[PDB]
Amino acid sequence: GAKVGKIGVCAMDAKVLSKPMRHILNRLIEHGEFETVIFGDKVILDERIENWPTCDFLISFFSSGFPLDKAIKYVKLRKPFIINDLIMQKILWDRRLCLQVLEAYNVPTPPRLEISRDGGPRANEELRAKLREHGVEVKPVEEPEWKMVDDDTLEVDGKTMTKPFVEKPVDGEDHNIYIYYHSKNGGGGRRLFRKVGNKSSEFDPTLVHPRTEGSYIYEQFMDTDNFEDVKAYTIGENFCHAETRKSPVVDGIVRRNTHGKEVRYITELSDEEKTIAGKVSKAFSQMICGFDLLRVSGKSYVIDVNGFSFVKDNKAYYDSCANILRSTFIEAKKKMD
Numbered sequence: 001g002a003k004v005g006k007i008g009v010c011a012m013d014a015k016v017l018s019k020p021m022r023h024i025l026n027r028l029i030e031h032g033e034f035e036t037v038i039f040g041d042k043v044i045l046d047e048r049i050e051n052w053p054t055c056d057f058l059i060s061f062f063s064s065g066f067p068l069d070k071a072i073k074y075v076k077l078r079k080p081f082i083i084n085d086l087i088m089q090k091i092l093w094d095r096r097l098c099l100q101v102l103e104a105y106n107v108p109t110p111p112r113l114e115i116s117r118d119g120g121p122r123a124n125e126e127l128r129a130k131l132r133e134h135g136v137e138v139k140p141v142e143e144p145e146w147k148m149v150d151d152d153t154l155e156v157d158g159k160t161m162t163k164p165f166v167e168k169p170v171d172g173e174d175h176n177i178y179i180y181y182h183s184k185n186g187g188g189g190r191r192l193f194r195k196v197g198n199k200s201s202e203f204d205p206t207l208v209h210p211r212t213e214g215s216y217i218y219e220q221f222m223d224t225d226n227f228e229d230v231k232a233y234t235i236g237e238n239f240c241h242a243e244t245r246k247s248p249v250v251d252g253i254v255r256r257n258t259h260g261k262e263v264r265y266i267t268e269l270s271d272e273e274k275t276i277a278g279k280v281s282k283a284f285s286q287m288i289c290g291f292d293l294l295r296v297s298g299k300s301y302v303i304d305v306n307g308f309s310f311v312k313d314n315k316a317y318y319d320s321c322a323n324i325l326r327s328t329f330i331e332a333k334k335k336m337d
C-alpha cells in the first residue's frame with residue numbers, strides 16, 4: 001500500500017528486539033505502508049532529546065533502565081502520535097495509584113485495606129495533572145490506627161478484614177507478597193518471592209502478624225476457579241487475548257514445562273471480561289496492556305496492571321496487532337492530514 005508514515009520505537013533494545021516486536025514490525029513494513037525508526041540504547045541513554053530521531057507514530061514504554069522522564073520530555077517537544085501514555089506508566093510503580101485508577105473507571109478489584117507508612121504516593125505536578133484527567137487525586141495520608149484483633153482479623157481505622165488475606169508492598173515492582181491463612185485452614189502463611197524472574201514460595205506455620213515496616217495493601221484472598229490466575233492482553237478497547245496459569249497462593253505449586261516456562265492455557269473471555277479489558281486499557285491510557293484478573297465463581301476482579309505487554313509466539317496475535325496498529329495509524333494520519 002501507499003506509505004502511511006514512520007513508526008518510531010523508543011524503548012530499550014532488550015524489548016525492541018523481542019520476537020513479538022520484530023514480527024509485528026515486520027508485518028507493518030513488509031507492504032511498504034510503514035517505515036520503522038530505530039532509536040537504540042546509546043541514543044536513548046546518552047544523546048539529548050532534541051537529537052533523537054523523529055517519526056509520525058511512536059511506540060514507547062518503560063522497562064528496566066529506560067529514562068522515562070527523558071522520553072516524556074521528548075514527546076512533549078516532538079508530539080508524535082502515541083498509543084501508550086508515558087506519564088501514566090509511572091503509576092504502575094505504586095499499587096495504591098493503580099487501584100485508585102481502576103476504581104475511578106469502575107473496574108472491580110478485591111476488597112482491601114491499606115497501611116501506608118511513607119506518607120502516601122508521591123507525584124509531581126505533571127503526574128497530578130495527568131491523574132486528574134483520569135479521575136484521581138493524589139492525597140497525603142498518615143499511618144492509620146491498626147491492630148490484629150485476633151490471629152485471624154486485621155483492623156485498620158476501625159474497618160476489619162478476616163483471613164485469608166494477601167499483603168502486597170505498595171511498590172509495584174516488589175513481588176515479596178505474603179499470604180496469611182486463616183487458623184481454621186491450618187493457619188500460618190506463605191512468602192512468595194522472585195529470583196531473577198523465577199517465582200518461588202515458602203510456607204511458614206508461624207507467619208501470623210503483618211509486616212511492621214514498609215507500606216502495604218491487604219487484599220482479601222480470593223478463591224479462584226481452578227486455583228488459576230488469568231493473564232490478559234489488550235490491543236485497544238476492542239481486542240483482548242487471555243491465558244490461564246496455576247497460582248501458587250494456596251499450595252505453593254507453580255506449573256512449568258520442561259524448558260522451565262510457566263504453563264499457560266488459552267481461555268475464552270466472557271463479554272463482561274472483555275468489557276473489563278477495554279476499561280483497563282482506557283483507564284491507564286495503554287493501548288497495548290497486560291493485566292491480571294481473578295475468576296471467582298462468576299465474578300472477575302483485576303489485581304494487577306502491568307502495562308505494555310505482547311503475547312509471544314502467537315501468529316494470530318501478531319497479525320491482529322499489526323492490523324489494529326495499521327488502522328489506528330491510518331486514522332491518526334487522517335486527523336493530522
Ligand SMILES: Nc1ncnc2c1ncn2[C@@H]1O[C@H](COP(=O)(O)OP(=O)(O)O)[C@@H](O)[C@H]1O
Nearest residue numbers: 110166175219220221222229247248249303304
Ligand atoms: N487478592 C488475591 N487473591 C488471590 N490471589 C492473589 C491475590 N492477589 C494476588 N494474588 C496472586 O498472588 C500471586 C503473586 O502475585 P504477583 O507477584 O502480583 O504475580 P504476577 O507475577 O503474576 O504479577 C499471583 O499468583 C496472583 O494471582
